[model samples]
Target chain A: DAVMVFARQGDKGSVSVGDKHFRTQAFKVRLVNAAKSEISLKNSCLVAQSAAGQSFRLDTVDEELTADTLKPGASVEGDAIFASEDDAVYGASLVRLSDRCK
Target chain B: APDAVMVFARQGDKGSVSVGDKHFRTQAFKVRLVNAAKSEISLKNSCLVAQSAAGQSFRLDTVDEELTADTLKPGASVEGDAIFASEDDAVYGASLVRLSDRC
Candidate 1:
């Protein structure tokens, strides 16, 4: 089973990636592996999607998912994220949206 | 030559030489120094100066609390709007400098 304990704490209007400005919605997400066995959260990132299918990856100060594998009921809390600002950032999820996030 | 290490630091790159070994990286309008070590780190943009060869000095527009970080805990960093007052085309590789280096 795959369960992501994502909580929206707040919203940040903007963050930048090497000068490319991005709006962000902030969150503190915990990835809980509810499966009977171990699971791989490989290069998984927090995704914020907009109305027109625009979603940006969450950014922590050079931090990524703590473990590649998680046991059942065990989780890792990657603290803080620069969410998104563009297009209302209607929703959030976890995915491998981009390769740079790993 | 050895200076400006933080300027070239990609996001998540640790500081080459600085207090708390702040995680150093640059964004469009900002250069952030994050503390990942086991204690509080004093933070201030005035401590950092960005320069490009054949370029002039400019202002670092404070975004959020990017300018003032008297004591940032682990996982916390500074933010700002780095205002470049000239043609960006003339700018190439950017270098980060510590004001303390001059003293």
Candidate 2:
């Protein structure tokens, strides 16, 4: 078994990360450990990309997705936010956090 | 000059539009845009406007606030959907009107 991560659009409003506040939409990124071992999430664990091979900036409240080492069958959830016009992200494409960013 | 690389789009009835008190059933498209710039660029107010093969055009009014909220460097792209009211699914192509007049 391995770690499973699922993402989709979430709440849209004013969310703050330190002094920087963003009005952009966010992805509800959920990570699940469907494996038999513990998984440690790195700083660059996931990324949002395009079909044409370009990557986009999908930022969380903190650069680090989480501080907890996901145990076997355990899960973690957070918001992966991006900068865009409000309502522009509705019905956006299906983006998988399958790889790491450069 | 900037390029609005349209990756994919789909039509759905979940989108809606209104002029004052009159609301209309609209179709929403899930679209993604790639910054076709050689360097890291900040995207602002970029939107998807679709045109039909018959020369009819539609502007995306009800859009997701999250789609254009990123300052993507090269290789970065954002995903979102836009709404337009039409009886025919005859959309030919889309362009980033805010970035440039052409697609």
Candidate 3:
């Protein structure tokens, strides 16, 4: 079984971190099961790294970026956050305990 | 006459990770030093570590926050940046090696 990751153009919004204000952009990072067999992703931790070498761990808000176990043909999306000062070039990764992929 | 030396250190948050049945946690720190010594000193084989196998190692920097040069001349200083998972205070150390004096 193989896994496919999908991404979508998300919405733009605003966020405040400390006294600094930021104009935020959103993206949907999704994970899809490409095989017929069901696989489980546990202890899932998602993180976004900037071009500047700084990293921000996205919060599990709503259904988008939940840590719940995933099933075959089912997909989950996550929205990562960053500050403008970071001029952040965003890249994300999924790290977890895997049983299907050895 | 003797030369001069000073050490600088910073505290980092405590972080823990469990690998199998073993639960590992450690304190972290950012450390550096200034050398007023009459001769130049060379730093050798310095490394920073995180408790978990997944945690990656980052390169140390000089006081200017740039990649460090192995050699430090008189009146020079160096700094290393590291991260740990702990929210509380954590402690970590590095191997500081000083070679024979140079001009």
Candidate 4:
């Protein structure tokens, strides 16, 4: 649940977000870009329960990028904290980009 | 083998220790670093053995660092706490506790 995944480079200079590509380097190059025009960060993520009954949460805290325009090697990493309760499962999916700064 | 037994250790505030697929809180262990370097890492500590259903508690004083015969390495195997399933023989499943650095 704590693993990190990166996007692979695309053919065009730009990469896609959800279903398309956006410029991989544009995130650092511009505060705003064509992709940012459509997508804004949100609290959507996935969580899985392990055999030990532990909950694992996964959230991307950095700038929002969809699979469409995601750049090659673009990655996200989240923490894996274990507790005795079922709440561990929500820790990942319930995570939002807004909380990243906090 | 007295119902259940756990030997818990800690390293500072962020370390963790668990046994028998059960998580035991070790915040009170007060583990202090005895010796630590790139190649050598030793802890001077003891364990607080707690049983399930028993009210009384037992304490083993600053015993020794997690043992390693040929030196320690990440993912290295060693003996931990031993929990006897019965009152006679020494048997354990995830008895040894480990307090590792916060990732």
Per lDDT, the best of the predicted structures is: 2
Ranking by DockQ: 3, 1, 2, 4
Per-residue lDDT for B1-103 in model 4, tens only? 1111112232122223456765433322221222222343332232224222122232232333444233433333344332212221121111223232221
lDDT of 4 by residue, A1-102 (tens): 122332221111111111221111101111122232333233333233344544443322233333323333344333322122122232222212222322
| DockQ of each candidate, alpha-carbon based | 0.03, 0.02, 0.04, 0.01
lDDT of 2 at B76: 68
Cα distance off (Å), candidate 4, residue B14: 21
Model 1 achieves a DockQ score of 0.03
Which ranges in model 4 have alpha carbons more than 4 Å from their true place? Answer: A1-41, A46-48, A51-73, A85-102, B1-47, B50-62, B65-103
**Model 4 / residue A92 / CA error / Å:** 13
Quote the true-contact fraction of every model: 0.00, 0.00, 0.00, 0.00
In candidate 4, position A6 carries an lDDT of 27
Docking class of 1: incorrect
| Tens-digit lDDT track of model 1 for B1-103 | 1112112122211112223743223323345555545666544333444444333443332234545556667555555444322233322233322222221
The estimated TM-scores of all candidates read 0.39, 0.39, 0.35, 0.24
Q: Which of candidates 1 and 4 reaches a greater DockQ?
A: 1
Task: Compose the digit string of candidate 3's lDDT tens values, residues A1-102.
Answer: 444543333455656778886554455566666568765455444443332334454443446555455677787766554334443423312121223322
Pairs clashing in candidate 3?
Answer: A64-A77, B14-B86, B14-B88, B15-B85, B15-B86, B27-B90, B27-B91, B28-B90, B28-B91
User: After superposing candidate 3, which stretches have Cα over 4 Å from the reference?
Assistant: A1-39, A42-65, A69-102, B1-5, B19-22, B45-68, B83-103
| TM-score (C-alpha) between model 4 and the true structure | 0.24
Mark the regions of model 1 whose C-alpha exceeds 4 Å error after superposition.
A15-20, A61-64, A83-102, B1-103
What DockQ was computed for model 4? 0.01
lDDT value, candidate 1, whole model: 0.44
